């Protein structure tokens with residue numbers, strides 16, 4: 020608690036920035052970055068296996084993002100989509116709609132964040148249908164605004180379901196059929212046509228990076244469509260190439276009615292999008308708008324991200340580098356009993372820590388200590404999960420094979436030195 | 449409705465972007481910009497007296513914003529304030545707190561938009577106090593999200609008051625004392641201590657650019673403080689040098705408890721801020737957070753805006769160029785009877801149009817036609833107001849004396865040729 024520490028960048032953050040928006044696990048204080056590496060005020064370098072919770076899709080200082088943002092700042096097509104059309108925003112909407120199977124029928128709404136986008140999707144669908152009921156999952160993370168929290172699991176007529184977890188199956192049913200049956204029984208108890216939409220994550224993020232059982236999401240989508248319920252796929256976390264296909268729903272044998280994007284869409288700038296049927300997004304005007312929505316600098320960044328996914332073959336990169344990561348982690352699991360489950364798709368990877376592999380008892384304290392030690396060793400990653408025991412890895416898609424190796428090595432050391440981290444120091448955060 | 453028009457940038461915007469977030473008055477379609485001028489796809493240049501609703505504080509392609517954003521993109525301090533401190537965000541918070549009279553007691557929360565910021569302020573104050581009641585004004589524009597609309601005038605325990613307008617005074621009382629008296633009588637009817645906060649705009653934006661009567665806001669603030677009600681000053685529209693003082697409340701003889709900033713703070717990037725007492729912003733953690741909040745590119749832009757306000761003496765510029773604008777408009781009022789009132793401070797200017805100066809009957813249809821004709825002539829401005837009859841001028845602070853002249857000349861022509869605009873063409877929007 021001395022003056023030198025209080026005067027460093029982390030101490031100044033405490034004195035100037037309120038705690039309201041902080042989610043802090045260790046005293047990471049960044050002054051710069053390059054590739055998949057962060058540089059602290061003191062000059063210390065770290066590998067960022069978080070990639071800013073997935074937002075730094077192209078890592079730090081990617082030349083495509085430099086080029087686009089500098090170009091747009093020097094010759095910006097205004098500042099907004101609200102009261103003018105602008106070139107970069109329109110080009111972006113065109114590209115996003117062309118990427119999606121509903122390209123002939125769908126349009127785009129632009130926001131600043133995943134929270135904003137999920138709020139707008141819910142508001143538009145309820146307006147369009149005149150119904151407010153909504154299905155979502157327990158543990159779902161759809162945002163942290165009043166409008167997006169109304170159907171988060173982490174609104175009038177909310178039905179919340181368990182998300183089927185192959186490692187901890189609801190009703191001991193590894194197929195997830197018991198969750199579908201539960202949904203049917205819930206729907207039987209409400210008036211016909213009273214549910215407007217279903218929000219789903221195709222890999223549950225904050226819930227624990229939980230890939231649902233084979234077939235489950237297709238079946239779920241079929242139940243929704245049988246009731247005329249719009250299926251909204253929240254791909255803020257696992258979209259745009261991260262899963263090893265461009266859209267994560269490509270792994271799951273269905274196409275949603277509405278696709279929600281964010282995080283890495285902006286490559287480190289604030290950008291989100293909803294791709295929805297024209298009838299949904301055209302049901303009102305001047306209805307869900309913020310002044311800087313569709314600003315050209317952020318639109319330019321989104322174009323750069325899409326262009327770079329193509330130019331650097333990042334779908335295939337994510338699939339290759341995800342296999343490499345998972346190989347490394349499987350080697351770690353030979354040596355460290357704490358590792359209970361390694362899961363995910365592409366470069367959305369979760370590692371669940373347990374005190375015993377038979378019982379699967381969660382290792383909550385151990386996880387928090389692990390990530391603190393990793394920070395000390397020069398690797399940044401966080402945890403998530405209902406039980407606080409799932410390491411989250413969402414590195415930049417451009418992270419090199421060498422940086423994947425180094426991160427795995429640093430993680431190996433963290434696991435070895437877990438214990439060394441004091442309870443008091445960790446409970447500060 | 450032919451293919452060439454449908455294939456131009458405005459037509460493509462209609463086919464790809466939903467109407468949900470649009471607020472369109474004429475078919476403005478922008479491909480670039482420089483200074484205070486926009487360039488359409490077809491190459492036509494326009495003077496932007498809107499400045500993107502106030503957001504383009506430094507105009508288009510300002511070198512300070514180019515330099516900052518390019519620098520931060522090339523060496524970004526991560527992407528977020530949530531799970532790391534970062535250098536530009538901390539420096540920004542420091543500068544914002546130093547600018548405010550509550551510098552010893554206050555901290556900062558960062559958002560993407562004015563809507564986000566107003567939502568966060570309301571959530572924090574209600575959490576901190578355990579009270580949800582709130583005072584706001586009829587006609588108030590605090591945002592367009594579920595959380596910011598809950599106390600907009602354009603929440604449980606909402607008291608809404610008339611905003612005192614010198615041109616149309618409530619109860620024929622030009623001082624606004626009747627509105628204060630009404631407030632006292634409303635407060636007498638609620639339980640002691642049940643109102644947490646009062647949101648006010650120091651010039652009402654969407655309401656009609658309405659500068660309140662001398663003394664009113666100081667008196668209002670005193671009533672609030674007598675009841676322990678936190679005073680929140682929403683300066684999203686008229687803050688940061690636009691009024692000819694750095695903070696608009698400087699004209700009004702009070703200091704708020706909480707200051708909300710947005711729009712031009714980012715100079716065309718999405719950035720907002722709340723400056724509030726530490727006890728308010730420290731009352732929770734992980735409570736009001738979005739992944740890209742405090743990202744360094746947007747923080748860098750905000751630093752550039754603050755630095756440029758200083759380096760280019762933009763407070764004094766706004767006061768000088770606002771006098772020049774108001775002189776020009778006063779000349780227009782000699783010739784065009786429609787002009788009923790010219791008001792505002794600095795470069796936040798409103799011109800209210802009336803069918804007759806004695807009766808003050810609003811000229812709603814005429815206003816819409818006027819701005820459409822102006823667009824055709826090469827000037828961009830919009831209207832606002834309860835009666836749809838207030839031209840809004842919020843140009844970039846860097847707009848030159850020559851561009852002010854040209855805009856006034858183009859407006860003179862618009863007024864002359866109002867009639868020429870067809871009802872059908874204008875009612876399309």
Ligand SMILES: *Cc1c(COP(=O)(O)O)cnc(C)c1O
Pocket residue numbers: 131132133134135137160161162163220224253254255256281282737738739740
């Ligand atoms: C991150 C995330 C959001 C929210 O995005 P923000 O930018 O934090 O508002 C929504 N949905 C999912 C699945 C997410 O991972």
Ligand SMILES: *Cc1c(COP(=O)(O)O)cnc(C)c1O
Pocket residue numbers: 308309310311560561562563564566589590591592649653682683684685710711
């Ligand atoms: C523009 C404005 C807002 C909302 O800002 P957005 O960026 O559109 O969310 C809030 N308050 C006032 C006074 C405004 O002018």
